[PDB]
Design a protein around this ligand. Structure first.
Ligand code: NI
Length: 341
């Protein structure tokens, strides 16, 4: 039975609610982005309208084999009507095709659902600026003071320099990046660009990337593992055993591997600065752990909410326990006091 926090009151709409069968009274199902927990239960047999970004539509079509008649791509930053209600999709700065959704309700109420997002100052100069928000449905993945991380920009800079260096010392070294769904593509496309290479990967993942409206993508990727000095592999395979195994499967063309794991947060954000970072090494194989987050840090979240001044906040992550719910309440109260709103 679909939870309240996936329902937009006053409408027949839900958000990211596909794993409940047919929801009683839902005329339109919104999907914020193409990640598995959020699209869970979508398939070729789904028969009701799905509202989403272009990129999210490409992916529902080509990967999930959803029938073209039930996919309703909407453009970003544009006032659109759906079943009598004015909506806007905004870029969520999360993964390719991820959106936030503004609902302007018949009764003059306005509702922002963030889906998954990583808050950024640029958001303050969008359609969100122009009016008051009554309810906020907030991605609270990192809602606790200990979650600090560096900027996406700082992290990609580190990984570029580290890769360039290792391959200039040894031009038969290979670079491997871990992946398991969309998002974090900027890590590996940036590395391949500096190095003058295409990015080699499997057929399934090559497909995924063709859906994402990247300019000139065909010139940047390949399934030729032998004509490629950057390769993608499942995140699980990013350990000493996996990397060795894969090194034997290229045809003696590389004699070393430098590999990257874009993790979210782990306990060494609380001490190690990015410039200090050093890899674990074993023979001719090296693994750097980099904190590339696609969600708001605590400070990012706090600043965003304080700007927005919503009347009510509804969390959409870490909601299952009383501990978590109560802890988040505490922080939202602190933010409100500190501001005055
Ligand atoms: Ni996500």
């Amino acid at each position: 039975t679909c939870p309240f926090y996936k329902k937009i009151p006053g409408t027949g709409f839900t958000v990211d609610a596909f794993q409940y069968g047919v929801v009683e009274g839902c005329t339109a199902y919104f999907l914020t982005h193409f990640h598995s927990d959020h699209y869970a239960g979508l398939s070729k047999h789904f028969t009701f309208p799905v509202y989403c970004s272009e990129i999210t539509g490409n992916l529902l079509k080509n990967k999930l084999h959803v029938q073209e008649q039930y996919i309703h791509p909407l453009p970003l930053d544009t006032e659109c009507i759906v079943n009598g209600v004015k909506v806007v999709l905004l870029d969520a700065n999360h993964c390719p095709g991820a959106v936030m959704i503004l609902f302007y309700l018949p009764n003059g109420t306005v509702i922002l659902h963030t889906g998954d997002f990583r808050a950024d100052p640029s958001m303050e100069r969008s359609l969100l600026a122009d009016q008051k928000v009554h309810m906020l449905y907030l991605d609270t993945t990192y809602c606790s003071p200990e979650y600090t991380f560096p900027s996406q920009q700082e992290v990609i800079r580190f990984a570029i320099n580290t890769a360039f260096e290792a391959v200039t010392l040894n031009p038969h070294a290979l670079v491997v990046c871990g992946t398991y769904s969309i998002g974090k593509e900027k890590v590996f496309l940036a590395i391949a660009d500096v190095l003058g290479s295409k990015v080699g990967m499997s057929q399934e993942k090559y497909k995924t990337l063709q859906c994402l409206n990247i300019p000139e993508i065909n010139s940047l990727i390949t399934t030729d593992m032998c004509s490629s000095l950057v390769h993608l592999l499942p995140m699980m395979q990013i350990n000493f055993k996996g990397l060795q195994s894969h090194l034997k499967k290229c045809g003696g063309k590389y004699n070393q591997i430098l590999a990257f794991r874009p993790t979210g947060w782990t306990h060494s954000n609380k001490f190690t600065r990015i410039a200090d970072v050093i890899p674990q090494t074993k023979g001719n194989i090296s693994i750097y752990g980099i904190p590339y987050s696609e969600h708001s840090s605590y400070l990012e979240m706090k600043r965003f909410v304080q700007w927005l001044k919503p009347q009510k906040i509804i969390p959409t992550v870490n909601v299952g326990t009383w501990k978590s719910r109560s802890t988040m309440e505490k922080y939202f109260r602190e933010w409100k006091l500190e501001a005055g709103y």
